[PDB]
Design a protein around this ligand. Sequence first.
Ligand SMILES: *[C@@H]1O[C@H](CO)[C@@H](O)[C@H](O)[C@H]1NC(C)=O
Ligand SMILES: *[C@@H]1O[C@H](CO)[C@@H](O)[C@H](O)[C@H]1NC(C)=O
Lengths: 72, 494, 97, 48
Amino acid sequence: PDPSKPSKRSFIEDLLFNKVTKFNGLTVLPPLLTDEMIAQYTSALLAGTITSGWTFGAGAALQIPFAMQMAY
Amino acid sequence: AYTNSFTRGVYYPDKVFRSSVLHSTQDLFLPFFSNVTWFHAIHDNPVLPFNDGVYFASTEKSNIIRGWIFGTTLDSKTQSLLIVNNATNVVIKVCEFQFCNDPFLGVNCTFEYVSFKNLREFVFKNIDGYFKIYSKHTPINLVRDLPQGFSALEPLVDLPIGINITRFQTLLALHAAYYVGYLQPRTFLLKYNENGTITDAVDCALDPLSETKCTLKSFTVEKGIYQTSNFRVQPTESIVRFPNITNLCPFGEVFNATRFASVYAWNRKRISNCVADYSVLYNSASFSTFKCYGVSPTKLNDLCFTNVYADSFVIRGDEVRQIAPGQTGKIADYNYKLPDDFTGCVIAWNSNNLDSKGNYNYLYRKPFERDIYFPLQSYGFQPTNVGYQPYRVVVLSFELLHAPATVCGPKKSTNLVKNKCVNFNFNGLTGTGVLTESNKKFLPFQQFGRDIADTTDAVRDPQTLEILDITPCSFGGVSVITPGTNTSNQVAVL
Amino acid sequence: FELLHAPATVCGPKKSTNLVKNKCVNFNFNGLTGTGVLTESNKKFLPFQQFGRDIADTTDAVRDPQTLEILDITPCSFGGVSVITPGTNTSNQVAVL
Amino acid sequence: QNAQALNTLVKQLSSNFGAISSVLNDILSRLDPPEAEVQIDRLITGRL
Ligand SMILES: *[C@@H]1O[C@H](CO)[C@@H](O)[C@H](O)[C@H]1NC(C)=O
Ligand SMILES: *[C@@H]1O[C@H](CO)[C@@H](O)[C@H](O)[C@H]1NC(C)=O
């Protein structure tokens, strides 16, 4: 995530969002999870993946040096 | 004085048996928790409106209330339904009764019949001339007001009186409070039990949880959010716009013409830049026929046209039937053809007392074609010839294409109101929405704009040539956020 | 003419027949027809009710117009047939469900 | 695909389906109920 943005999305996520683009009883409902909330979930999944490998999936997020994580 | 109707004033709506079912019905019921007028009989028998119908209820300890009067004037000038219960004999009459200045009971007829501790509930409604009576008697122990609770009323009587009832009055026995509540077209959900007795009810338009019970067909509602309705804003007033022209259309010059043309060479007169009052032609009894294939003849007063053409000629009486879309024959095919998509009205009357003599000036031989051993034949019309008599026929062809309307009927315009939800009519084109100023540059020949759905997008005001945008008044789904009814009856609305 | 399902006061010149219970029969009650088994019932119709109805708006029960008792209408037993067959190439014998 | 589905649905409102007009108000403003109902049923069937 980029802290300088109005919505804390990563550089790559912004690229993705910038590429994908009545009165007759037809309306559109909003999603329950807003783009900001989705960004928070992908951020959590990413932060977990980077700092704790797969341990956060099974149980607690257990810190591990990234280089060691790669060794596994 | 007023009281709370609560859950009283529901009746078995039909002679259909049901049980263990949450059935739903629309009929003239008393709306739940609405106010009913409370009258007293101590130390009060006014005339009340009947409106669309009445729930009546009374509380007794000594049988003071013994009857009812229904009618418009209740003074021997009209027929008035009278119901009286004296000791053990119920009496029903519908005579033109002479009632007292103040009717009471001391301690040209078309129908006659002869047979607090007590609550006696009744329902009166007057549907296509039928006076339908439902009632229920139940023991009570309450003096102050109507008891709270539920128990439905059976139908007992249905009198085909044919009386126009607008007012009613009660009859008291003088040496017992009563209530009058107006019925309304409210849909209900009704809990028929195992015995088939309605044991609970939910008025649909009471509150958003009641809408949710009406939508789910259930007296119990689970925790969630439910799309019970669509909220749509209503209009306030209507807006009627037509070109402010006072010229009248020369129909007299067509229908009362000295001479009609022959069918081989029929005339076509253009009617434009005028007010067309079609009530005169329709109401006139002089016509043998006035048959419309395009639009109904009574709508012609509101509706208006880009042009109207009057096709005027003489035919033989039995041939009147051939002047219609979809018809074929020696006249329909050879001398006077209409489009099979023809829009308009064919008007005809005999001229046996005008053109007939013999009169040999009438000759006969694509749609609207004028075709000016020969194919040419003629009639000798004589006053002694019905199917062989001459008829004067005028066909009125109406062009309803959406374009500037030159022929608009006798209807007054109103002022135009902007930025408010309104019911509009522009040159016969109607709809509901918000009229606003616009920046849509209509070309001088354009009168209406359209959207993808072919609905009207914008219009040009026919009196002042400015463009108004039409945006439908704000609307959207309602939804009712509710915990389970096991936890609460409180709800929130989206 | 008022044809609403309610007790019929005006009925034309047609003779009635005897009523047979617990058998599949073609019935006509005051002009209302159908086919099924008429049985005794415990459905307490109110005095003003003449016909009962099911969810499908079909008749559930009726009040006999001559003797005011309630008869239940249950359609006569029915179901899919199915033919159990080893292929004709194997044999022309079959069994029926 | 979803935009196309909605655009198709809206465009269908312009169809007559055998009626004299796709515009419901134009049927009602021109015909009495005994005839208007027939034209409307044609639109209801098509729109439904
Ligand atoms: C009923 O009457 C009371 C006054 O006693 C008033 O406040 C209330 O708004 C009225 N309700 C309705 C639905 O008319
Ligand atoms: C139905 O009536 C019976 C009495 O016949 C009564 O006991 C019962 O509580 C009533 N309610 C039902 C079962 O619908």
